[PDB]
């Protein structure tokens, strides 16, 4: 699989990985929303959301 | 899954010592950071030294600091200080089992300091105990660092573990329990403390 | 200043319901996460569980250690500002000092301060109070140090005085000792100039709450 792996609002960035899923993880710090993209579909700690797909650089947005 | 940190570590005063817990990805690698370091003083509450996102608690020292590198959390002291030996807990929050993990603990001691040779005193059992067919002999060791010692009984020739004192030197407590009749009929019992190639033995015997 | 302090029965026996109360101050119950925490004597720190404030939004009300899911409940009441434990189905390996916990996240789950309070000891035994006895410990460089002996009581919790406090400097009350016997004995000691020792008086106040014994022994 292909997985975004860009943070935030920075430039967009790939990555292969051998798991099957990509992810978008976000979550709020003291001005604004923080996203962490990568890939697998990871749990979270309360107060995160989370959002997996199972197709190539499908956790862009 | 588990975290896991060495039992021991040792550190000269004034020197860096970390301490390492070795975790997950689940756990002290999940992002968004959440890694706690408490203090423990033996016989005392934990304090927080470090939490959530190796933030520092307040009136904490800022030689306390702690850092992440993969799953791997670290605290470092930037200059150990007496004060500093303790056990050192690190926990962290696991997204998988949704708990709160702890480590098993680092003890923290302090070498190099200058070394306070023990004061021993050894009581017999009072004319009540004997009275209650029982002998119960005290050995009170105080005012000795570093704070690692040996106690050794005998006769005719259950310890506690060292904890600190007020003043910032180590103490021990020592009982030999025996029956009325085994110590009424002894000839000498003695207390023997070994601590820094030193060793001081003070005696007390069936009286009148 | 969060101050958190435990209350509850410090005896309980085996198959019994454990119900421990923390009375918390200067952090809000009702935003702030709070929970509990356990230490076995001799052993190592055991999360217990929390109960989650209004602060993180998505998550769970409660969370829980899983070792312990289907004996334990945590609830609180945000009036009373108090937090609660019930823990059922008791075992020796229940025995342990009890913390309760408070948590100040602002953005997510343990981002924020843990406070913590003194702990309370709950012991899981089928046995029942032993009062201690107090005797003295006295013996024959310009200092000389007496004490008194608390010996074969049950449950663990004891505290020592001396003079009724009026005296701190150079006391040490020593840890506990469990012997064979199933009982448990300490010591406390004062270091005094060897002067007062034919000028001044000294007696030791020992106390045991579990079995509200409170003694007074004099050397």
């Known amino acids: 699989r292909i997985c975004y792996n860009h943070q935030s609002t920075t430039r967009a960035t790939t990555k292969s990985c051998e798991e099957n899923s990509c992810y978008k993880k976000y979550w709020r710090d003291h001005r604004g929303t923080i996203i962490e993209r990568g890939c697998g579909c990871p749990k979270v700690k309360p107060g995160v959301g989370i959002h997996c797909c199972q197709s190539d650089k499908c956790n862009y947005g | ?208 | 200043q969060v101050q958190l302090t435990e209350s509850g029965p410090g005896l309980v026996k085996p198959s019994q319901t454990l119900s421990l109360t923390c009375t918390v101050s200067g952090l809000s119950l009702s935003r702030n996460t709070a929970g509990w925490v356990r230490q076995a004597p001799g052993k190592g720190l055991e999360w217990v569980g929390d109960i989650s404030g209004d602060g993180i939004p998505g998550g769970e009300s409660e969370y829980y250690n899983p070792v312990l899911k289907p004996r334990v409940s945590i609830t609180k009441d945000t009036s009373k500002s108090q937090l609660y434990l019930t823990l059922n189905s008791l075992t020796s390996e229940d025995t342990a000092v009890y913390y309760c916990t408070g948590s100040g996240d602002t953005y997510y789950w343990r981002d924020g301060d843990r406070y913590w309070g003194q702990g309370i000891l709950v012991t899981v035994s089928s046995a029942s109070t032993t009062a201690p006895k107090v005797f003295p410990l006295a013996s024959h460089g310009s200092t000389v140090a007496l004490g008194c002996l608390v010996s074969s009581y049950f449950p663990e919790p004891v505290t020592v005085s001396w003079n009724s406090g009026a005296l701190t400097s150079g006391v040490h009350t020593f840890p506990s000792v469990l012997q064979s016997s199933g009982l448990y004995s300490l010591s406390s000691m004062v270091t005094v100039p060897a002067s007062s020792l034919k000028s001044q008086t000294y007696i030791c106040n020992v106390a045991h709450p579990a079995s509200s014994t409170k003694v007074d022994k004099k050397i």
Not at chain 2, 132 to 158: H, M, R, Y
Not at chain 2, 167 to 184: C, D, I, Q
Not at chain 2, 193 to 208: C, F, N, R, Y
């Open chain 2, 1 to 208: 899954q588990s975290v896991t940190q060495p039992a021991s570590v040792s550190g000269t005063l004034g020197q860096t010592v970390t301490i390492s817990c070795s975790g997950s990805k689940s756990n002290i690698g999940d992002t968004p950071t959440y890694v706690g370091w408490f203090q423990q003083i033996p016989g005392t509450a934990p304090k927080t030294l470090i939490y959530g996102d190796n933030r520092r608690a307040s009136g904490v020292p800022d030689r306390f600091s702690g850092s992440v590198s993969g799953n791997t959390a670290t605290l470092t002291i930037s200059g150990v200080q007496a004060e500093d030996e303790a056990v050192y807990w690190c926990g962290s929050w696991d997204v998988n089992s949704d708990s709160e993990l702890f480590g098993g603990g680092t003890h923290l001691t302090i070498a190099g300091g200058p070394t306070s040779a023990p004061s021993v005193s050894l009581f017999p059992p009072s004319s009540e105990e004997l009275s209650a067919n029982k002998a119960t002999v005290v050995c009170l060791i105080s005012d000795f660092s570093p704070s690692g010692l040996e106690v050794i009984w005998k006769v005719n020739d259950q310890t506690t573990r060292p904890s600190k004192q007020s003043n910032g030197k180590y103490a021990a407590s020592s009982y030999l329990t025996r029956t009325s009749t085994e110590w009424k009929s002894y000839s000498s019992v003695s207390c023997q403390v070994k601590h820094q190639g030193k060793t001081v033995e003070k005696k007390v015997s069936p009286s009148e």
